[PDB]
Amino acid sequence: RGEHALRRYPTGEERCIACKLCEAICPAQAITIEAEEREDGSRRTTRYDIDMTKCIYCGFCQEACPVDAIVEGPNFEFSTETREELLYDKQKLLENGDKWETEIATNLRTESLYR
Amino acid sequence: YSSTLMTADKLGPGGRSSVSGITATVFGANGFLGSYIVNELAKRGSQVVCPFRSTENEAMHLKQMGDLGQIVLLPELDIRNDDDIKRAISRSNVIINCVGM
Amino acid sequence: VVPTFDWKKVPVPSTTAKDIPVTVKGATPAGDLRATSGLGLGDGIKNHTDKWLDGDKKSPMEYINEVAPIKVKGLVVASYGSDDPALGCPVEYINLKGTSLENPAVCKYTGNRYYSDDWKG
Amino acid sequence: AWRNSLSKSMQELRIHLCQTSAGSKGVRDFIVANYAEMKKANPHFPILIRECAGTEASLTARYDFGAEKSVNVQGATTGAVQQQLEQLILAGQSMPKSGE
Amino acid sequence: EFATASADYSIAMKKAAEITGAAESAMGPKEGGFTAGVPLDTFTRKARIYAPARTASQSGLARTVDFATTTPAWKIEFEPTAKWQNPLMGWTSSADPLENVGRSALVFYTKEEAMRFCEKLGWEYEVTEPNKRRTQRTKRYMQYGDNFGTKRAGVPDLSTLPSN
Amino acid sequence: PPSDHLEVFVNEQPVKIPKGSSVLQACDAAGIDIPRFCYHQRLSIAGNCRMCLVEVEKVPKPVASCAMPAGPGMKIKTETPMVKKAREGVMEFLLINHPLDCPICDQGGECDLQDQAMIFGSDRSRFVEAKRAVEDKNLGPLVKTVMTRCIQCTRCVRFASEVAGTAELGVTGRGRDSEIGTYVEKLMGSELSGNVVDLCPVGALTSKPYAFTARSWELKGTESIDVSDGLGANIRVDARGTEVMRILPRLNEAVNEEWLSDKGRYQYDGLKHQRLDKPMVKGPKGLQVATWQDALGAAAAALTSAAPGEVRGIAGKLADAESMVALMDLLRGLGAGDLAHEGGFSDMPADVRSTYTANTTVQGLEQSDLVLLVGTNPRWESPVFNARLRKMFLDGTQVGLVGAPVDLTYKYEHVGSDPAALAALAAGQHPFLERLKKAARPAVVVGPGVLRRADREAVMKAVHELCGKAGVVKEGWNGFNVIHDTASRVAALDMGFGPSAAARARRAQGAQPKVVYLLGSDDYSEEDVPEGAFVIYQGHHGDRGASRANVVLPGAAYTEKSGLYVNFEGRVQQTRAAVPLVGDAREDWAILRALSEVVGKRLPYDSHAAVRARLAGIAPHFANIDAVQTPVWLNGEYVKGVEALAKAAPLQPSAPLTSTISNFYMTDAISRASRTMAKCIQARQQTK
Ligand SMILES: NC(=O)C1=CN([C@@H]2O[C@H](COP(=O)(O)OP(=O)(O)OC[C@H]3O[C@@H](n4cnc5c(N)ncnc54)[C@H](OP(=O)(O)O)[C@@H]3O)[C@@H](O)[C@H]2O)C=CC1
Ligand code: SF4
Ligand code: SF4
Ligand code: SF4
Ligand code: SF4
Ligand code: FES
């Protein structure tokens, strides 16, 4: 359970559908979500924040997600010099997922036999 | 302009998490008087921009003085360069000069 | 008796009428009411994607619009979003009758589009 | 006649009563026997009859500049509340005037 | 016979509330706030004692005053104070210490229990009695057999029959 | 009575119930809450979901408790093995074709199907076949359909037939392919069309403006009142921080039962646009932001430099009683008397409360067997009140109307259209008078469009003569009712917010004010606000009244304050703050108390309780919240008292008795700023 990340389908569409289950289960209340409907009618988020200085790195959000959108990736080396660099918004989490997608998929090909 | 500076954007009762509406640039903020002025502005919920010439170790005490995002630190200030002065005041409605010798 | 009401003579303020959030074709009729919340109103942002994406970066909506609809034989299709059903979405059963390449049916989980030439047409 | 005088001394008259209480009987009799004649003399004078369950019978005169006086009339007869309205009329002459 | 939720630990909670000597504890007005040790300006605020109505979205009645003896349903609520947005992230900020304490933690079986708590703590209170549900249906569609009655269009006239 | 309450046994407990009650009502009187999907209290019984199945002794099958009547000495069992097996089986049948849609569904968190599956159902499924897939339907801009989630309870069909009256939905097809909707593409045109979203127990019908924005567990709910009309429907406001997310009705059988019109439900998005959040003073550059001290000083300077006869104060449609009594006392303390109301008939006499309120009350009107409407359109003035009128129609109450013919969703007899027809009815020329004379409890409802007329006194005299001849008001029954369409009018009539005789004379000879105070007024006439006058606007939306003002003082909306409002039956109700004040706005009575201090004559009250006590000192019924007095009836003495107003401004027997509401979806500044109301109008314009 490392740095949180947001994932896509192979087409390039976001997996997240703003169900707010990960926000409800979070014991630290480290997630803040706002949503409305997109211009094509889809149900998508407009804000998805994770306070990494409030997070406890439990993985409960990863368990609660029904579409495998939020994960905790294999990155542990993400120390910064300012605390404002650790208040992640939606764009940075998507950038993390776009960085770590192949490793996350390799990990999930094994861990889907157990979960 | 008159008293719209202190009233128009004032949000919250006035603590560390509140908003006063002041964006200020303090020149010579790491000095003796400038540090107290920066503490006085930031504790009421104002954004304070602090350019400095010295090393970061001598300016680290200004980082504590305000909430997240409200203390802005700009190292390698050269006051013979107008670009640094232009960047440091580009969002401020208050400028305070404590530079002396 | 009971005269008809003329709705076309009802005045609407021009500031309100020009600011109605509507939809492109997608999963609705084009031009129906789009639900919005208050986020972004202080910054003057009326668009969904601009509220969280900054720059000329390729949006997710522009990614899914480049994938063509998929021809499926039958009347109902099951959508998982993956080859492996454990790795995708909960299964969505999408109606395919009355659908064509021009007016396909869209998955509410994935945004993939499907149509069938099996409903006597 | 006191009824014609009841547009110059005061700006408004407010009557408070209970609908069923024994103490508001004389006030109700006064209103029933005198509202039409007090309104016929001046058709534009506001006479606010207001009722609530279990309240105290009271008369209130509003003068100019927002001034107000009150007299408690609970347990009074029709002649008695007539009298109290008449001293409400009398105090209206010694009030400052407005409008001009 | 007596059976009013007679199969759970709530039997052992109704008694232990009526133990002698402890069932008659009483304090003077505002006295419990003096010994509470919280700042005294907190008791200058106003409180509301009320039982919240059923949500319109659902049909169940469990969180209502229908099950008042089974479940505590009366609440204490306070007026809102100022909120604003965080400049860096946009999160909702507040300075209210009583922002969620009445809605999360304080529940009472009756109206008078919540009044007693407010009186001994020093809060000034207003009490709102909930609106009573009506169970009697309309005259039309009173029973299922009134869907098919003669009240739809009257008794049928037998004047279009053959031989009239 | 021959034992009008019969005794049944529910789980061996004796229960007394009224006669004609079902098994489900007997279970409810025993403290048991039977699961249900198709039963509703306000609809007719259907009996098709099979979830309410209980066991009755000497019956080998489970009975449907919603439909089965309760007999004497009946023994009901609700916790035997066959009842639990029945509940699990019916739930399993309900879930085999349902889509796995809970993450994307808006009912998730407040779903009857989810919670009943958790409690009365099993934890597994054994179904691995393909499901039924259904295309979605278009029903307009307010109702969103995902029809794969339909469970065929037919609550929507019964609602549209019985309460809304439009009867436009049906079930097409047969068997597994049964399908709810309209066969052709149609728009749901009822004003009460948002209530069916509440009535649907699943996420088949959800609210389109609300869609995908929030979950129900995040919302802080506040019980408030509705101010979009004069009925004052009881509502619940759900907010997330500073933002109101939705508005829902709540139960009040004396006011609104369980309904709410689409304007009162969907106008909340106008609270996010054109909001006044700062004080402004007009300078040479124009209106610009100023401090509260500067704005109060400018308003006080203009209010004091003018003569007292050149000051006018106009109350808006949404002003609470505290701000209105504050403005009234402040203007009267300066020696002014020119008070006006944006809702019209400002010179109407307010001496007896029975002459401008509904004496029968809203729930007491159901005991009337014949109803005569005079010059009103109740479908556009109060659609919830019109729904209760349709409910009265469905169980036998006959309706007649004197006025312009309108669609009311029930059949009525058009007696006439003008006051000439009213006089002919009073004389005896129309046979509807004999129908009124033989009625046990006749009722007359007079709308606000009659009171807005210049000859309203003669029309009210004719109505009083008709009520005297037809026995409308007698011993034991008072059937005379006057309704309103604005939230603030009855409180202003209660407190005496009316112009003085000198001010009425000065308006008659054409005097023009120089200072105008606009207490939330944006629909003022041009005769009342002259050009070149000094305008002080106090309000919450930037509109017609704020674009013209010199001093703008930002106040609170009805979702941000707790003010008193009185509906047209005389019931004192109150709002509650669901969100805090926006920006640098203030409480509305507090602005006037501060302004009275800056002028130089302080108001004698410094708190919300003290201004409410001042209101109770003027009229004592203000102190009794959520209740209505029985008003005094003075027979024909009141009509005899105002005969001078009948002789002057004589009757106009040719002008039709009409309703003044020409735009139902946009009636005030909040609904004019709502984009949802504009889409609602555009949907009715693009259908032609
Ligand atoms: N009692 C007093 O101290 C009095 C002070 N004043 C005036 O008020 C101000 C207070 O200064 P004070 O804090 O008291 O003493 P300081 O010397 O501590 O203030 C010096 C500040 O000016 C900065 N500075 C000096 N020269 C330069 C330069 N060439 N380029 C960039 N930054 C520079 C220093 O930065 P670095 O740390 O990198 O040098 C430091 O931040 C001065 O103007 C002083 O003359 C007035 C009356 C009396
Ligand atoms: S890992 Fe734990 S703390 Fe971090 S976002 Fe998920 S639930 Fe919250
Ligand atoms: S990340 Fe997953 S659980 Fe969280 S809101 Fe998006 S879809 Fe729901
Ligand atoms: S109606 Fe919606 S929330 Fe309820 S069970 Fe079905 S999919 Fe889930
Ligand atoms: S749409 Fe809703 S109310 Fe209508 S039949 Fe289906 S489940 Fe019932
Ligand atoms: S509630 Fe009785 S069968 Fe549906």
Q: How far is the C-alpha of A90 from the C-alpha of A78, rounded, in Å?
A: 17
- The residue whose two tokens read 């209210």 is E96
Q: How far, in Å, is the centroid of ligand 3 from the Cα of A32?
A: 11
CA angle F671, F676, F681 (to 5 degrees): 85
3-state secondary structure F621-633: HHHCCCCCCCCCC
Q: What CA–CA distance (Å, rounded) separates F392 from F257?
A: 13
| Among candidates A36, A41, A91 on the partner chain, residue whose Cβ is nearest the Cβ of C28 | A41
Which of E144, E146, E151 to mutate to probe the F interface, most F CBs <10 Å?
E144
Resolution of the coordinates, Å? 2.8
Inter-residue contact F516 to F531 (CB < 8 Å): no
Cα radius of gyration (chain A): 14
What's D79's DSSP letter? H
Please state the length of chain A.
Answer: 115
Question: CB-side exposure of F48: number of CA atoms within 13 Å?
Answer: 11
E97 touches chain B (CB under 8 A): no
- Give the gap in angstroms from C-alpha E45 to the nearest C-alpha of chain B: 17
Spell out which residues of chain F touch residue E3, defining contact as CB-CB under 8 Å.
Answer: 11, 13
A30 ligand 2 Cβ < 6 A: yes
Place of tokens 């976001």: A14
Judge contact between F470 and F505, C-beta under 8 A: no
First vs last Cα of chain C: how many Å apart?
47
The answer to whether F580 and F242 have CB atoms below 8 angstroms apart is: yes
**Cα E102 from Cα F48, distance rounded (Å):** 42
With b meaning 16 or more CB within 10 Å and e meaning fewer, what string describes F399-411? bbbbbbebebbbe
Beta carbons of C32 and F406 less than 8 Å apart: no
Q: Does F214 touch chain E if contact means CB atoms closer than 8 Å?
A: no
- The distance of Cα E33 from the centroid of its chain, to the nearest Å, equals 25
C and F touching (3 or more beta-carbon pairs closer than 8 Å): yes
Contact E87 B18 (CB under 8 A): no
Tell me the two tokens of residue F29: 């009187």
The answer to whether C26 touches A42, Cβ cutoff 8 Å, is yes
Residues in chain B with CB shorter than 8 Å from the CB of E92 are none
Q: Find the length of chain F.
A: 688
Q: Which residues have C-beta within 8 Å of that of residue F378, sequence separation ≥ 6?
A: F385, F386, F389, F408, F445, F447, F483
Cβ of residue A61 lying under 6 Å from some atom of ligand 2: yes
Token representation of residue F10: 């529910």
CA distance linking residue F291 with residue F564, whole number of Å? 29
Residue labelled with tokens 């007079």: F446
Q: Which residues pair with F246 in a beta bridge?
A: F238
Three-point CA angle F632, F636, F637, nearest 5°: 75
Q: Is F630 exposed, middle or buried (0-12, 13-18, 19+ CB in 10 A)?
A: middle
Query: Can you tell me which atom of ligand 4 is nearest the CA of F102?
Result: 8
Which residues numbered 28-87 in B keep a CB inside 8 Å of some CB on E? 47, 67-70
Task: Name the minimum distance, in Å, from the CA of A47 to any CA of chain E.
Answer: 10
d(CA F546, CA F535): 9
The answer on whether A9 is annotated among ligand-binding residues is no
Number of C to F CB contacts under 8 A, please give it.
Answer: 99
Which value, in Å, is the radius of gyration of the alpha carbons in chain E?
A: 26
Q: Contact at 8 Å (CB) between B68 and A84?
A: yes
Which residues are within 8 A (CB) of A13 and not within 5 positions of it... i.e. 6 or more apart? C60, C61, C63, C64, C110, C111
Instruction: Specify whether the CB–CB gap between F520 and F555 falls below 8 A.
Output: yes
**Structural determination approach:** cryo-EM
B14 Cβ under 8 Å from any chain E Cβ: no
Q: Of A17, A36, A37, which has the smallest distance from its Cβ to F103's Cβ?
A: A17
> Is residue D79 less than 8 Å (CB to CB) from chain F?
no
C-alpha C113/C-alpha C105 separation (Å) is 5
Coil, strand, or helix at residue F126?
A: coil
Nearest alpha carbon to residue F39 among F48, F26, F31, F29: F48
**From the CA of B33, how far away is ligand 1's center (Å)?**
8
User: From the centroid of its chain, how far is CA F186?
Assistant: 27
Q: Exposure pattern of B43-63 as b/e (b: 16+ CB <10 Å)?
A: bbbbbbbbbbeeeeeebeebe
Q: Inspect the interface and report whether the beta carbons of F291 and B4 lie closer than 8 Å.
A: yes
Q: Is residue F553 helix, strand or coil?
A: strand
Distance CA F241, CA E1 (A): 51
User: Which residues in F have their CB inside 8 Å of a CB on A?
Assistant: 102-104, 108, 211-213, 215, 217-218
Can you read off the two tokens belonging to residue F602?
Answer: 């302080």
Greatest distance between any 2 Cα atoms in chain C: 66
Pocket of ligand 5, candidates F50, F161, F205, F206: which has the most ligand atoms within 8 Å of its Cβ, to mutate? Answer: F205
Query: What are the phi and psi torsion angles at B40 (to 5°)?
Result: -65, -40
Indicate the helix (H) or strand (E) that contains F645.
Answer: helix F643-647
Query: Which position has the token pair 């053959």?
Result: E162
Query: DSSP 3-state assignment of D28?
Result: helix
Chains A and D touch (3+ CB pairs under 8 A): no
Instruction: Look at residues F687, F630, F657 and name the one whose alpha carbon lies nearest to residue F446.
Output: F657
Task: Inspect the interface and report whether the beta carbons of C67 and A43 lie closer than 8 Å.
Answer: no
Q: What is the DSSP string of E39-92?
A: -GGGGGSEEEEE-PPPPTT----TTSGGGTTTS--EEEEE----EEE-TTT--E
Contacts of D77 (CB under 8 A, 6+ apart): D26
Strand pairing report for F515-519 and F534-539: parallel
Q: For residue A36, which amino acid is it?
A: E
SS (H, E, C) F532-545: CCEEEEEECECCHH
Atom of ligand 6 at shortest distance to CA of F36? 1
- Ligand 4: which of F100, F111, F215 to mutate, most ligand atoms within 8 Å of CB? F111
CB contact (8 A) between residue E131 and residue F396:
no
